[PDB]
């Protein structure tokens, strides 16, 4: 057999698990072991997205689950608890097990119980592990998934930093961005229509002040998974190449490559070099996912400017979207003042703000000025002071034809933009009427709710 | 040219072709020949999933096709016959053909009649043939792919066991498990939106009593299709690694992957050394086709355990669900009793046996005693007996809530399960009425269907 | 840092960029150079198909945009211009470049304006750029990508040809050859679910009069993009074999496959070398994109047969439908006839002789004869002379079950034909009453439009 190492040496060892998106410390040992491995698994409200809530199952309280790091050789045994608080029972399948079920049929957990099992790892690689419960889709979709790394006996190469992203499709009842607790949907999921696309487990998980960090001059290894349950991701890196791109513990290493196709179930470790500073955007280029449903992840990296390599400027709002800020924590802020029943025009205001970077000021501006003849102001504008209900039209509907817009005609087309919800609507027209000298008041979801239907 | 190997010369070859999941012998032969290649198409129902009959096309009454084996450097006199029972035209095109359409110009055959033409394999490999007739989507969905083998002159290293896999998308007018005849449905293929995704043409193909067949320490080949039409199959092998995995007539090679994506039209070699015993399953991971839709097959391995390497147990029904069983026939027989107005009591119950497995059995066992105060019992239900018509309400819509189930309470939810057919829900609960001392009794489909519709 | 060949030394060099599917000559110079690239944006609208109009968002004025051709080492000094006459603001990222959004951040261009950003080109490889304004995802869905070649120092390997081809999926609102000028769809674009998949920007682009050209014994590459937004191609060459497959500036060479993924974003370059004459056909082999979407292209090849290797024939329609004629003008033709109220009989029977070519011909031939007793005439059909009506049904809805036609029983099925759309029934129905000793006459629209209600 592989991994032929010999029995395990030394004392057992504790396996010390991280929470993404951080790595256990390279095992850094020259003799198999006894790894004693504990998950607890652990299902519980978190937010998907500002002000949504999702029931998430999770092992390890995080999506995705607790990183584990072992060597090639190693003798696991492997303790999965189910906490009390579990409705549904749960079990694991790693990859990279060799044995029925990746572990499955040995590990099947009732709420409050636990189960152990023992495999050798022969396998050298990164590899998914998830929920093995039927329905498997489900227990999948809820974020039931995480990496396992078993290192090569010599262990990987020494960089700067590591970090554990993992992609995965969900299925919300709602639509992208509809505030609220979701239920799982499992017509959406059949049909592998997800609402949500995510690195790990939320929108913004990885963005602004959760980027991840290193400086010119280093090298990165990012453990990539693809959790699914059902798409494949076609993983890129914005503005960057990969040095090296190797799946699970396969002898095949592919380099020089900025886009690779991760299988549903799969994982790859990637490297990247540092060369100019500034935010690299780690994407699903089936774009839609990206910049439509979440599945945009930064590595930011500080140093020094290089001209000779790139003379241009770092990342805005035109490209990140709502996601060049830090966070968008005035959604959430807003949408709990909602639920409360304490809604204030600058809890909308703020919220507005957050939302309006990207979705309106790409055209508009940041501070409302749009171009003269080209994009009309939102600033002191007549035209929006004149009718809000024509501007919550406007957002909605779209407009086009030509318009007088302080004292200036345009002749232009403004998209739709329906796919906005009722309170993100509201909201961003709040924030338009209370800054740049408009007239202030307020438009409600309820408002918008109006016009929708109409 | 590739392949040059000079004249045929020996005998002309008739050549011997198999049946999915089989394989042709090696040909085992150093010169090149003249092979004649006979495959006929039949147009045939055969059952898709049980009491589920679809109308395929076929070559050689499989789907998959016959399994073709020729060397490198043979000239292949092909002979395709269209059986006079047929409806449509057909033809076919072969990957690793030199020439248009792959052969599709020269093989059109109409009901009645036969084509030949003739090409010489100069590129060694792993190939997919299909129809190749406007609609050609049409055709493909219907069933007509299979796989060609194009040996390297030498001869590929001898294995223990060679087998036949192939995946397919299908597309019913109704939903998955939907009794009857099935017709194809254009608009579900266009939208790229299945309704079943198998392998060898059928539910179950695979499973159970259908099992491929292996030994601890023996190798197994399987050459694994993907004849689409519209899907790219992340493959996957759960509890086990891929040896090697090598695409068409690639010369890359990887090995040791467990996870490796297909492309639609694409086919693949693939080796497996077996290490420890029980089922390993083949599977789409993009999970939803592999545990909703039907993509899933095993490969049994019998022999020793060795603990040292894995502790654990066989795959059950908690993760293979309802085919976990040997077969699923009960449910065959209880559809074919329904059209025949001779459905008995007992008929349901043994169909609803073979479905409660894995669908019911994960969360209230196979014996129906749940666990206390976590899953509550079926077997000598209070609150099961109560209300029959609640208990269809409660697997159509699920529950939640504070119950009291034979003396004690419960306070967890059980997910709707709404993707159940009315004639599951239906034989299901007859069964589980006419077991562990419940009152007997049925529940019709029409009875599920008045449910369904309040 | 790569790419490491010194400062940029003769004389500047203004780039000369090629519109698809034609490539600029290989950059045949030995020191690095600073190339000035200039590229305009132009929103236009052109035939996505024939009579089918479509608002495109394009670099150069194409789709995919102009090809750009520089050496691994060259600084790139880039200027975006987007012309007066755009609506919407665009800028672009291009992969290969090391730096933020691959220029997006400082090449953001309003209606009228210029901007400038440079770079050195450290990274060899064929990549894909694309805008990225927000939202990203309409602007790549209009058309907004093409394709930037790095070459090695060396230069590649000398061939005959070269040809740059690239793959989208397109979002209309209206079904797949519902004519008239048809807006994108946000809603078709976030479910993924497009109404076209194309090579070069239209149905057709690739096929016909014109396909790509080389003669028996010539070496082609293809440099292949993928610029989504959404979709991943199996792309394939019918009848044919790849040499070789390099992805973007990968080190690994896959050699001898016939189909391979093509991830969103991505690119590849492919060679071919030319054995025996005929059309080889570019699809994604995801089928019903190819077949029922648009994504063919031809690489028709002239030379002498060679027996030994094909015996068979080229391509005609029962493969490729109503690509295999030169060109379906004649729609075109008929669908402005109809906008301008002066369509003609003869305007109708030239479009229905072009959609009846595969659609129809495949079972009643290419001169309605049919086949006795298997596929019924159209040819002097007394069943379709009696009831024009009823044929429109037959069309859309299928017929099946005894019918007498010229004398002789039938007894098979016509599937249903409901994709089609009113006008193009219409067409195909006028042409058959107007051909073949038939009674004349016609079809309107609106008596399909009618029939389809009912
Ligand atoms: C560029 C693609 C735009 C984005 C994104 C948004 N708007 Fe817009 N808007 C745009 C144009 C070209 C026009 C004029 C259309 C015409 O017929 O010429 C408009 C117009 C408006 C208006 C009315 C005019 C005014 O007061 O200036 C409003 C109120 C408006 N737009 C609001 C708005 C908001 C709130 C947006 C984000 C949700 C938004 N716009 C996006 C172009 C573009
Ligand atoms: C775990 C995910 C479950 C599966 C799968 C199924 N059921 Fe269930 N069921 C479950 C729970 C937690 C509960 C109680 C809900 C609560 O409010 O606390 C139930 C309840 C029932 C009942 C009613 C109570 C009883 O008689 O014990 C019935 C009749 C029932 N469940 C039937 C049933 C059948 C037939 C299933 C397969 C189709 C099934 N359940 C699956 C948890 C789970
Ligand atoms: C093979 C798959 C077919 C294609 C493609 C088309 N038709 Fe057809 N058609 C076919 C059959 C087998 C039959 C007879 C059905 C039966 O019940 O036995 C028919 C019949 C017709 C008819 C009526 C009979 C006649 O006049 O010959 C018409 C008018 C007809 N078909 C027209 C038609 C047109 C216009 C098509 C392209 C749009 C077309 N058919 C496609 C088989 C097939
Ligand atoms: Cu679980
Ligand atoms: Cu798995
Ligand atoms: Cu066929
Ligand atoms: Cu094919
Ligand atoms: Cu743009
Ligand atoms: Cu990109």
């Given at each position: 057999?592989?991994?032929?190492?010999?029995?395990?040496?030394?004392?057992?060892?504790?396996?010390?698990?991280?929470?993404?998106?951080?790595?256990?410390?390279?095992?850094?040992?020259?003799?198999?072991?006894?790894?004693?491995?504990?998950?607890?698994?652990?299902?519980?409200?978190?937010?998907?997205?500002?002000?949504?809530?999702?029931?998430?199952?999770?092992?390890?309280?995080?999506?995705?689950?607790?990183?584990?790091?072992?060597?090639?050789?190693?003798?696991?045994?492997?303790?999965?608890?189910?906490?009390?608080?579990?409705?549904?029972?749960?079990?694991?399948?790693?990859?990279?097990?060799?044995?029925?079920?990746?572990?499955?049929?040995?590990?099947?957990?009732?709420?409050?119980?636990?189960?152990?099992?023992?495999?050798?790892?022969?396998?050298?690689?990164?590899?998914?592990?998830?929920?093995?419960?039927?329905?498997?889709?489900?227990?999948?979709?809820?974020?039931?998934?995480?990496?396992?790394?078993?290192?090569?006996?010599?262990?990987?190469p020494?960089?700067?930093?590591?970090?554990?992203?993992?992609?995965?499709?969900?299925?919300?009842?709602?639509?992208?961005?509809?505030?609220?607790?979701?239920?799982?949907?499992?017509?959406?999921?059949?049909?592998?229509?997800?609402?949500?696309?995510?690195?790990?487990?939320?929108?913004?998980?990885?963005?602004?002040?959760?980027?991840?960090?290193?400086?010119?001059?280093?090298?990165?290894?990012?453990?990539?998974?693809?959790?699914?349950?059902?798409?494949?991701?076609?993983?890129?890196?914005?503005?960057?190449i990969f040095d090296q791109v190797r799946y699970?513990?396969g002898?095949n290493v592919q380099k020089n490559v900025q886009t690779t196709?991760?299988?549903?179930?799969?994982?790859a470790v990637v490297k990247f070099t540092?060369?100019?500073?500034?935010?690299?955007?780690?994407?699903?280029?089936?774009?839609?996912?990206?910049?439509?449903?979440?599945?945009?992840?930064?590595?930011?990296?500080?140093?020094?400017?290089?001209?000779?390599?790139?003379?241009?400027?770092?990342?805005?709002?035109?490209?990140?979207?709502?996601?060049?800020?830090?966070?968008?924590?005035?959604?959430?802020?807003?949408?709990?003042?909602?639920?409360?029943?304490?809604?204030?025009?600058?809890?909308?205001?703020?919220?507005?703000?957050?939302?309006?970077?990207?979705?309106?000021?790409?055209?508009?501006?940041?501070?409302?000025?749009?171009?003269?003849?080209?994009?009309?102001?939102?600033?002191?504008?007549?035209?929006?002071?004149?009718?809000?209900?024509?501007?919550?039209?406007?957002?909605?509907?779209?407009?086009?034809?030509?318009?007088?817009?302080?004292?200036?005609?345009?002749?232009?087309?403004?998209?739709?933009?329906?796919?906005?919800?009722?309170?993100?609507?509201?909201?961003?027209?709040?924030?338009?009427?209370?800054?740049?000298?408009?007239?202030?008041?307020?438009?409600?979801?309820?408002?918008?709710?109006?016009?929708?239907?109409?």
């Open positions: 057999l592989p991994g032929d190492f010999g029995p395990p040496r030394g004392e057992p060892i504790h396996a010390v698990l991280t929470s993404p998106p951080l790595v256990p410390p390279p095992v850094n040992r020259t003799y198999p072991a006894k790894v004693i491995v504990e998950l607890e698994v652990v299902e519980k409200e978190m937010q998907i997205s500002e002000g949504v809530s999702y029931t998430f199952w999770t092992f390890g309280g995080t999506v995705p689950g607790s990183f584990i790091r072992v060597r090639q050789g190693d003798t696991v045994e492997f303790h999965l608890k189910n906490h009390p608080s579990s409705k549904m029972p749960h079990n694991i399948d790693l990859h990279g097990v060799t044995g029925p079920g990746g572990g499955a049929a040995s590990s099947f957990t009732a709420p409050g119980h636990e189960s152990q099992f023992t495999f050798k790892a022969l396998n050298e690689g990164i590899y998914v592990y998830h929920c093995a419960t039927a329905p498997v889709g489900m227990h999948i979709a809820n974020g039931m998934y995480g990496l396992i790394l078993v290192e090569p006996p010599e262990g990987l020494k960089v700067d930093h590591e970090y554990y992203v993992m992609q995965g499709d969900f299925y919300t009842a709602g639509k992208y961005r509809e505030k609220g607790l979701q239920p799982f949907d499992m017509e959406k999921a059949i049909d592998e229509r997800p609402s949500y696309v995510l690195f790990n487990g939320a929108e913004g998980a990885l963005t602004g002040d959760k980027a991840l960090h290193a400086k010119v001059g280093e090298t990165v290894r990012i453990f990539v998974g693809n959790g699914g349950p059902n798409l494949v991701s076609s993983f890129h890196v914005i503005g960057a699970e513990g002898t196709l991760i299988p549903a179930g799969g994982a540092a060369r100019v500073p500034g935010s690299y955007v780690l994407v699903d280029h089936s774009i839609f996912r990206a910049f439509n449903k979440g599945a945009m992840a930064i590595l930011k990296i500080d140093g020094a400017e290089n001209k000779l390599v790139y003379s241009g400027k770092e990342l805005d709002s035109v490209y990140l979207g709502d996601r060049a800020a830090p966070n968008m924590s005035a959604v959430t802020k807003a949408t709990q003042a909602s639920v409360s029943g304490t809604l204030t025009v600058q809890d909308q205001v703020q919220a507005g703000r957050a939302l309006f970077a990207g979705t309106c000021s790409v055209c508009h501006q940041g501070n409302g000025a749009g171009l003269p003849g080209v994009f009309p102001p939102l600033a002191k504008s007549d035209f929006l002071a004149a009718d809000p209900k024509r501007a919550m039209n406007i957002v909605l509907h779209g407009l086009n034809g030509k318009i007088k817009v302080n004292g200036q005609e345009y002749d232009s087309v403004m998209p739709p933009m329906t796919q906005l919800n009722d309170d993100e609507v509201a909201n961003i027209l709040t924030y338009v009427l209370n800054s740049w000298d408009n007239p202030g008041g307020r438009v409600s979801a309820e408002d918008v709710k109006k016009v929708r239907a109409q």
